[PDB]
Amino acid sequence: LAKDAWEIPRESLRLEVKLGQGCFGEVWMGTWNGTTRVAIKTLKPGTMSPEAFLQEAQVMKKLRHEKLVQLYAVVSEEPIYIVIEYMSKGSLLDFLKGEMGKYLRLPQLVDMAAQIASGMAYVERMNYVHRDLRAANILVGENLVCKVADFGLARLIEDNEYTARQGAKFPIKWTAPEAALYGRFTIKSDVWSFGILLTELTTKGRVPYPGMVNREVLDQVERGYRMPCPPECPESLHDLMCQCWRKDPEERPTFEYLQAFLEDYFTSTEPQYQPGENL
């Protein structure tokens, strides 16, 4: 209900092109103050609470970093608008599976991973957990700039864990087992998700655990199953994914480590790498 200095007059926005639609509203490209290109997320009336919808803006007010999609402004009166940084190339997932993805090779994909890791290391430093980290929630700008987006589920961590409320449901294939099963969300469950995201990058958008169903993934993963090394992917990178997928969350690497490892990958880890047909 309470407003602050993020508020702007709706008249200062013009919605020009529809970029997407979901069960809770739409995303439009537009112009702000008749001069700035922006993205605008709208709230579909009577689908979600205004206060619930704006929690996402609240999180963004706090998390500011070159590798996170930036909040610009809010319209807190119905219809609710969240005005954010425009990412011209859209979703990483769609980018990877389209024509452009075909031309990408490992050095580029690893740099994209490193940028994402950079954003997440910031999230890590700030004591937040994202909870929805995956290629569909990464946005791509010019020159292969990648930023983490969609902070709807993000929460500030108190007591080392965010415990999910009863009834909450999360996508099994992209979520750490302890979070999906017991509701235990920590930065370490994000690290697990980052590992899944690495498979999305190296397969250029393939679904994780291909062919397997949710209950089977849950079952096999508990038994120790892990996705094998993707085709043409160096084993050292898959080794990194397996580290992200350790059963004990505290044994999973920090994003600080992940960022450094990926930044230095071709010097420290794979000095003699050469590009193949796909990676």
Ligand SMILES: Nc1ncnc2c1ncn2[C@@H]1O[C@H](COP(=O)(O)OP(=O)(O)OP(O)(O)=S)[C@@H](O)[C@H]1O
């Ligand atoms: N800042 C942006 N710049 C460019 N395109 C965007 C932007 N935000 C969203 N889009 C487009 O709209 C799609 C939906 O983005 P999202 O924010 O993930 O929405 P959302 O999935 O409803 O979020 P929730 O809270 O998990 S229901 C993106 O994947 C792009 O195709």
Ligand SMILES: [Mg+2]
């Ligand atoms: Mg999403």
